[PDB]
Design a protein around this ligand. Sequence first.
Ligand SMILES: Cc1cn([C@H]2C[C@H](OP(=O)(O)O)[C@@H](COP(=O)(O)O)O2)c(=O)[nH]c1=O
Ligand SMILES: [Ca+2]
Length: 129
Amino acid sequence: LHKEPATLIKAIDGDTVKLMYKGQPMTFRDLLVDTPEFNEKYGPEASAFTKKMHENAKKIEVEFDKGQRTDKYGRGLAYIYADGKMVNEALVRQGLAKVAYVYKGNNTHEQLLRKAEAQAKKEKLNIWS
Ligand SMILES: Cc1cn([C@H]2C[C@H](OP(=O)(O)O)[C@@H](COP(=O)(O)O)O2)c(=O)[nH]c1=O
Ligand SMILES: [Ca+2]
């Protein structure tokens, strides 16, 4: 897998963001995670977390997995990095997302994220409180 450039267009929520990729605007959905919707418990906190993580980054990058790169809604499916830190992993580590939507063929970072979730749960953080 490899990282590719992008630039933030706009925060959206815990697990989606509007980025410019290859010069085109796209909505990206984070692989392997599920954040609460904004109207649900910890939804606001998830959205705040990713808004800050994306807006503060000097360099956003996207990393597609081995499988399908867009979902049925036209959203890009990627691992997203903010100054080399994976947003997908950070969400899970903080108890602001669950590991979720693990489809074979696009699950390169599954075990990394499961390890984060375990530590979040051990610490009883957020969703796990
Ligand atoms: C994360 C992810 C979501 N999806 C689809 C499955 C779900 O379909 P349904 O909309 O039919 O439930 C939806 C979940 O996304 P959200 O959690 O953003 O709603 O997006 C994929 O197809 N591939 C993926 O890797
Ligand atoms: Ca969601």
